[PDB]
Amino acid sequence: KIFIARRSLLDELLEVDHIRTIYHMFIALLILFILSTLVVDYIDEGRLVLEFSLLSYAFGKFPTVVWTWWIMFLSTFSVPYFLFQHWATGYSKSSHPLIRSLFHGFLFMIFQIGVLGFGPTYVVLAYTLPPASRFIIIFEQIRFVMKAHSFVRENVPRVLNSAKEKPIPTVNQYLYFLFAPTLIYRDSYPRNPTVRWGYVAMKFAQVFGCFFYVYYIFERLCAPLFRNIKQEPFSARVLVLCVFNSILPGVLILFLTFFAFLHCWLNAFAEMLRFGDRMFYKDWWNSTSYSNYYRTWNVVVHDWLYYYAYKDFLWFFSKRFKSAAMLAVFAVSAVVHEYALAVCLSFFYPVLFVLFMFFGMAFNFPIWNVLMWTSLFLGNGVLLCFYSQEWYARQHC
Amino acid sequence: KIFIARRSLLDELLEVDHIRTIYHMFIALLILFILSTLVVDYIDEGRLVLEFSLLSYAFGKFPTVVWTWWIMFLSTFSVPYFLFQHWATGYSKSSHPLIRSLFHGFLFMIFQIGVLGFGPTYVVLAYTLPPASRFIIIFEQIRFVMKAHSFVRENVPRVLNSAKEKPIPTVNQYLYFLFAPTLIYRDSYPRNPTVRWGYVAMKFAQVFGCFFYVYYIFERLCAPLFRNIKQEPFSARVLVLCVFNSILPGVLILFLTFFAFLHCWLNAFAEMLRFGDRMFYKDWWNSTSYSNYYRTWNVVVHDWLYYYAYKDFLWFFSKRFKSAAMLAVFAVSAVVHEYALAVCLSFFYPVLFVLFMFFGMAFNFPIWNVLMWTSLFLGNGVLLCFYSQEWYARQHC
Numbered sequence A, B: 001k002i003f004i005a006r007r008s009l010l011d012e013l014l015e016v017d018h019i020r021t022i023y024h025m026f027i028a029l030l031i032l033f034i035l036s037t038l039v040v041d042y043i044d045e046g047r048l049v050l051e052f053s054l055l056s057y058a059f060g061k062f063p064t065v066v067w068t069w070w071i072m073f074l075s076t077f078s079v080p081y082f083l084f085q086h087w088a089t090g091y092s093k094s095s096h097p098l099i100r101s102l103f104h105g106f107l108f109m110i111f112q113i114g115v116l117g118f119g120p121t122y123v124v125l126a127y128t129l130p131p132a133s134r135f136i137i138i139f140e141q142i143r144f145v146m147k148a149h150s151f152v153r154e155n156v157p158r159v160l161n162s163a164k165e166k167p168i169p170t171v172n173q174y175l176y177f178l179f180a181p182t183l184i185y186r187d188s189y190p191r192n193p194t195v196r197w198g199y200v201a202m203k204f205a206q207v208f209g210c211f212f213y214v215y216y217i218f219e220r221l222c223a224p225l226f227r228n229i230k231q232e233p234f235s236a237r238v239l240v241l242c243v244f245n246s247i248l249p250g251v252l253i254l255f256l257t258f259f260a261f262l263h264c265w266l267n268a269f270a271e272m273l274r275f276g277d278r279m280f281y282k283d284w285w286n287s288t289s290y291s292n293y294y295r296t297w298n299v300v301v302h303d304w305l306y307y308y309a310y311k312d313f314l315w316f317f318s319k320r321f322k323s324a325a326m327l328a329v330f331a332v333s334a335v336v337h338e339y340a341l342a343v344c345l346s347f348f349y350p351v352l353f354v355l356f357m358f359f360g361m362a363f364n365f366p367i368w369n370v371l372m373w374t375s376l377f378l379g380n381g382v383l384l385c386f387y388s389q390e391w392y393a394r395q396h397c
């Protein structure tokens, strides 16, 4: 993939004053959120505003988290790099490389499935991190395993081709790359001129605001709907009204966390690292088809999945139909998302998996844009509703 | 005022696909509304979907309404026109016109305050129209009295100047004008080429959809929040949570009824009447100042108010400061809106009046755009909350 230096689409679309007043509408809704919250706290407690309880809960064992992420960063920075450095020369010199290459590949596969497959899982399941603090490092586990597989899969064909012709990376560029936003070792060879401290300052400020806005969304919209509403009727009417009323919190979480994470989080970590030289999403809100919607949401994970998984999984399978391969990579993406949600939530019941399959096989056989939006609203509503329902159901009993 | 033939701003802004997908997002939310409504009705009644109860309630005495509007149309079409026709020639010929002009002006003032000031009020308060059916014809009363005053105030200076120089309208152009969307007798002298039947068809279809969308908004968002939630705590927490949770129904009603009424209602009655040769709103969502917001929302009523009331009420008062005149015309607009809401709701407690004065005198002494949006959200929330609270409180006891 070619990395052309165009910015994020929202960063150039947000200067139009209608979208600018959409943004101001959101932050004025945030002002009303904090005002209602402070007023309710001041009328309930009488005084002592600004408690920040649930962020002290969900970010509890933060020293453990930073130590785990530090040893994880050191592991993913040293062990794959040193393993590949040790493998390259021996592959060049040894008499039989067909066995040694398989042996070091087995070493790397027992690392990325042993170290990055148990360590971030064992720390979580043993030291029992709170859900957000376990989610952050299982997301770091996913990011690290994907990035290490990308590193090795871009370096092994390079060494093999240069040895059939008869190119090891440097420590500095890998050290920088595992901090870069992208997920392909092609890397940030196109870079930016200067770190604009005010620009990254306002981007991190927007990250701050969007995170606290998610906090208040869970405080005012997902606390009344989902905290111990258990005068159990087991009614399908109550369930359909939950999946209806939890569309606004669901779709606000969707909009604002897409914005927050992609746009401002990794644009801050783009212009702080001088690699804002790629787009991270096209307009997914404008998709004539659902297959057209797949290619243009979270295009980093899509780039990784499509390129590596799809290309290798069809070139090695040699299937007659590529639609089967597309469904296979969508199934592996569904199981990856389900595993992430299962380890950060500690839950079965993958409504994401069966809902994904249903909305995929139901669209297979501008009115379709309206159907995409109603499917997206109903699916986001049912996803947030059922996952929050399970989470507050085990927290109930 | 000059009427230049530019279209509505939203009709040319809605072709951008981000705003187009905002529109499709709204109509997909409408699809989800009708789906949830039909599913709830089918799980509650077992069968027999598509009842349309509250539209049979609020549009109850529709034959009475159409007869009242027919006699109102005939009155406003004949009596002011014939009165002015009888006055013009006698003003031209009589020896003393200073007494006869005052006499016929008294006739017109006892018509527009006697006929259009009691008839639409007496029919409502005697035959007891349902709230929507009384609202439609008190809005027609306001529209007719404003339009008749505009007609007479554009014709009396014309006749006076032509008689000091020593121009009666035609029946056809007045007959057409009291159907036109605008509220100034300057009229639709600039007109449109052709009635596009498909265009007015889709505009009336959008009127249909927006009205039923308002219906469902009251069915799913203003029915749970406001129908007999009377386990009275009299709590300020419950009141602040009502004024918070009733922002989404309030602001959706605001957006969609602005859209519906102005844009599609009077654009259908523009292109059906071949006078779509004026704008009816600029971007009010983009207002650096609140005084800047006053000039650009519902610019028809603003044109009437500002031009006639402001100009005449300052030229006859000869005040030293025009800010006092602006506050006076804002006070008369506030009392007009309060009277409209009081006759269509049958209620005192003008939270609109005191809230208008508070938000006016609190802004008098892009962050201000955020303050405008938070003020607009909180004010729309408190307005809908308190008016619906009173309406369902007298319906309670």
Ligand SMILES: CC(C)CCC[C@@H](C)[C@H]1CC[C@H]2[C@@H]3CC=C4C[C@@H](O)CC[C@]4(C)[C@H]3CC[C@]12C
Residues within 6 Å of the ligand: A017, A018, A019, A021, A022, B010, B013, B014, B019, B022, B023, B026, B027, B030, B206, B209, B210, B213, B255, B256, B259, B285
């Ligand atoms: C059939 C029914 C449901 C369709 C209703 C469409 C209405 C609600 C949509 C269509 C066009 C939309 C407007 C288009 C432009 C803007 C400017 C933007 O800066 C703020 C939102 C705002 C003001 C939109 C508000 C909602 C809107 C009026």
Ligand SMILES: CC(C)CCC[C@@H](C)[C@H]1CC[C@H]2[C@@H]3CC=C4C[C@@H](O)CC[C@]4(C)[C@H]3CC[C@]12C
Residues within 6 Å of the ligand: A010, A013, A014, A019, A022, A023, A026, A027, A030, A206, A209, A210, A213, A255, A256, A259, A285, B017, B018, B019, B021, B022
């Ligand atoms: C500090 C926090 C509260 C600011 C949050 C801003 C977020 C929620 C705003 C700012 C920019 C906005 C996006 C800008 C562009 C579009 C395209 C439009 O067709 C649909 C809405 C959508 C997708 C907006 C969704 C909401 C959005 C992402």
